[PDB]
Design a binder for these strands. Sequence first.
DNA 1: GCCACGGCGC
DNA 2: TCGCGCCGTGGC
Length: 540
Amino acid sequence: ALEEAPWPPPEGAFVGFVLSRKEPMWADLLALAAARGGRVHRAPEPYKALRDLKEARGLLAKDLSVLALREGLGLPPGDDPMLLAYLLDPSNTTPEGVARRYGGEWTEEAGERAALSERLFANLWGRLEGEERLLWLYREVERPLSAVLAHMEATGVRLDVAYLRALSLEVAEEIARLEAEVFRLAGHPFNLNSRDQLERVLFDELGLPAIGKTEKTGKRSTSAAVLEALREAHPIVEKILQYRELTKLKSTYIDPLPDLIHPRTGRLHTRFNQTATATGRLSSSDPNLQNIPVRTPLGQRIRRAFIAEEGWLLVALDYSQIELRVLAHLSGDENLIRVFQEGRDIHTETASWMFGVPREAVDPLMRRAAKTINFGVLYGMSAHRLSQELAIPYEEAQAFIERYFQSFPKVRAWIEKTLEEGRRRGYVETLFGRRRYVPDLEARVKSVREAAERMAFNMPVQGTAADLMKLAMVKLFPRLEEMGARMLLQVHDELVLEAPKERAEAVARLAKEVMEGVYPLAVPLEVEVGIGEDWLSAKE
DNA sequence: GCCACGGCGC
DNA sequence: TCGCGCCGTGGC
Ligand SMILES: [Mg+2]
Ligand SMILES: [Mg+2]
């Protein structure tokens, strides 16, 4: 029968819990329960009952750990069947989906969530038997990383609220300028944020050619690609593109941020998820750091809003060209390995191979071509796309791509080898054995198959880079704790720390060493490090 | 409020 | 022709 016993539960019990909202730093803990041997213990008062647990063990353990940290408790996350499920198949991203797939039901009751957690753990543990690489990732990466991510989310980061107000005003003033010019050209006002109203203005009123159509609704598209053709010829088009860029930035990364400053901490608590992506990269939300513009002065001015506490400094560490380094390692291409061992400017050096010239004779446009292919090769960038990117003819783009593979032939071979592995086994894997299933390599529709192919050889590269970072995070954490420093943010191939100004230089030196030495590859791992009062200044 | 949707950032 | 999360729109 359904066994119940009073709170507190025995040691090693799985926990279940219900939040008032999904963000643990912002939620009330409504209910707390634990289960062992299928026997459920329900906490009369959940906040007091947290004190009784030595560990958060169960579904979404990291999230409960974040809320306990907020409350001044140290409840480190342990086993979590979500992490097992994600290793079995990274399409496993939510408790609901995991329950549906492997058994049971994700409900809204803490006791049931606790019992479910225990059953799923045993189930998924059994399904992993013999999978030694995935089990190594669980023990050395996923479980210990969950505790690091709890601390990052709970600690949060200070924002420069005066600066954000100044930036908001500047962007608002530019937006106002552009809409007035658009309304001047259209001869009347309308909602520039409405694609339906803009469609009418551009194509019916102004009579512009309508190239493409929308995916579902079957209307004339007003997308960037469709307007690109019209840009040079029609001023109103250019103004709309500028307008869209600024309003996207404002509404996503300027307007939301102060409301995310918690009343209790005086900090922004970015949420970090380790079971959200197909590749094994971490994701962030509230805000999504990954989608902050990387080019443009505007992306950079968002980062200036992120600041150190008074008396402290931010330390920013970035793995230079890590995906390309991983490609050199996985492919074993001797010439690409030479590019990295010569150890001068990587894109200049890549260009010298491609074009057959001494590095001194590589000009900035040749370098840009190499740099662009060094990014694009990783996912099969088309020659059409390269020709757009470089503003050169299609045939010349094709030639550049072939020049690249001629210099780096084992990269060409590795891509095909990886596709054969995917076709044979149904999955591809990273250096560490993180696995993604790739069923549509067999697809009949060429377009679907070719996207499947691109996802298939890109994942081992991105996923290896992801796990190198996560291992470094695991290794670095205890070394920072003992200096009074901490990790705050992770995005792309970058890690942002906060340290007291007196310890900042030593922390930079320690973190660089830990990151560069995390795992041996056929080429060196290189880390760029900078220190500053704000995140933009710490890029250096 | 819910949803699907276009559009765009990485 | 370069999947997913984000925003605002418009229908209900
Ligand atoms: Mg959509
Ligand atoms: Mg509405």
